[PDB]
UniProtKB/Swiss-Prot annotation, chain B:
Changing Y67A: Slightly reduces binding to ACKR1. Changing Q118A: No significant effect on binding to ACKR1. Binds to the human erythrocyte Duffy blood group determinant (ACKR1). Changing Q130 to D/Y: Reduces erythrocyte binding. This is Duffy receptor. The chain holds residues 211 to 508 of 1070 of the full protein. The lineage of its organism: Eukaryota, Sar, Alveolata, Apicomplexa, Aconoidasida. Residues 2-279 are annotated as: PvRII region. Changing D113A: Slightly reduces binding to ACKR1.
């Protein structure tokens, strides 16, 4: 949200920067959303025709940067990223985006001068997005997934939970492996390495900080899910609890094991990092 | 050479500039073609920029018609839509100035290979209803869904060779100019200056009125000669009710009298003889 041009010219590596729960404390915001290319949208009837051109250019630039981020590989990770960014464009257009920081406020203003602010303006916006989303997807996919699978409108908090889940299950093995390499087993016949070995202690503290961020992020996102769902009665067939989203998004997700992990009571964390 | 921005901001009045037979001598070019808005195409996704140029063109033709929703507006939309098509397909007969930049831009998009032309025609045929809609954007702002009843989409998206369409447009210009030029002539030349002599015999203002008429009708004759012969050579190098270029005038114009038309452009009609031939 804090720049306009530089973020249409390069992305950070994925997970280079963790979800941000501090800026607006009722939600956690992914780095990808912060970096969403909206240069033309910012520098912005015939105005509606001009809007569509500007949104197509931003979307193509976003989709191309995400390809380069995925090392030009055309695979599921790339397709998911396309879907997440497409979805956020949608919410920005529809006026239901949860970021609303910095230059996103300027874009919201631009849209208001184009569509109006009356009660039924938001209705116009939603309709215009429906009629445009296919083309935006095409535009993101131009440099190169399942179109109709993406175009399905889902509330933003649902989609950010899917994205969050994929980040968590990608981070978890790396973090556990780091722990293992420093802390596995014992320093003598009785005492775990964490009892006395400083590099193991360092490693456990680093893990603690990571899993504490994961827990706070799951707590904020999952509670946002519940309040959004209560406030606009988001009736979604497959999905009753926020855990349903993780179950459906993630291979071999075990929700009991998940709660154990983010609350530091799983077998691996206890074995490696709890002296007593 | 021509213009890029000016013609996307304003149009000259109708018939302020006559058809141009001098720039390319085997065809005559209408001022509307010369002014066709193509700013985005020139600076050139393609569908986006074409849609924008067409929307601007459509709104300008609406202004030219003084915001009147009538046949003259719909025919203009039809003529400009057709010209966009020949530009996209590579079959446009103007090909002056910025039109060549656009043709160059299209070649870098579609290619030049054996069937680049075939793909450009496919692209045009898939897009033409959409481009017509864009030209009607200005009307659709006001009438919403009822914009579709103002002009006939089906008539507009039928592909005719460009020379066919330009003959229809030419014919409509001719029958709009003729009553005016004849009235002008009549106001200086009607009747006699004495008991036996027609005014053209001795009245200089009438003699100059006849010269001026002669200048106009000579332009008309030359434009019809160039256009009708172009129709024939285009036809030979390649289709529904139209056999001769006169057939096109008959389809376009009310009760078109071919013999009278040939009399008029050849200065042997009754009105011209009466007004401008002394003996």
């Amino acid at each position: 949200g804090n720049t306009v041009m530089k973020n249409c010219n390069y992305k950070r590596k994925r997970r280079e920067r963790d979800w941000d729960c501090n800026t607006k404390k009722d939600v956690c915001i992914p780095d990808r959303r912060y970096q969403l290319c909206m240069k033309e949208l910012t520098n912005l009837t015939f105005r509606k025709l001009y809007l569509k051109r500007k949104l197509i250019y931003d979307a193509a630039v976003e989709g191309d940067l995400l390809l380069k981020l995925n090392n030009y590989r055309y695979n599921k990770d790339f397709c998911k990223d396309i879907r997440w960014s497409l979805g956020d464009f949608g919410d920005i257009i529809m006026g239901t985006d949860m970021e609303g920081i910095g230059y996103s406020k300027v874009v919201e203003n631009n849209l208001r001068s184009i569509f109006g602010t009356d009660e039924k303006a938001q209705q116009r916006r939603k309709q215009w997005w429906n009629e445009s989303k296919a083309q935006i997807w095409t535009a993101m996919m131009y440099s190169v997934c399942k179109l109709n699978v993406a175009v399905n409108i889902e509330p933003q908090i649902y989609r950010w939970i899917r994205e969050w889940g994929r980040d968590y299950v990608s981070e978890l093995p790396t973090e556990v492996q780091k722990l293992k390499e420093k802390c596995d087993g014992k320093i003598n016949y009785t005492d775990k390495k964490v009892c006395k070995v400083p590099p193991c202690q360092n490693a456990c503290k680093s893990y603690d900080q990571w899993i504490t961020r994961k827990k706070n992020q799951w707590d904020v996102l999952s509670n946002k899910f519940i309040s959004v769902k209560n406030a606009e009665k988001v009736q979604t067939a497959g999905i009753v609890t926020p855990y349903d989203i993780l179950k459906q998004e993630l291979d071999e997700f075990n929700e009991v094991a998940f709660e154990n992990e983010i609350n530091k009571r799983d077998g691996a964390y206890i074995e490696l990092c709890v002296c007593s």
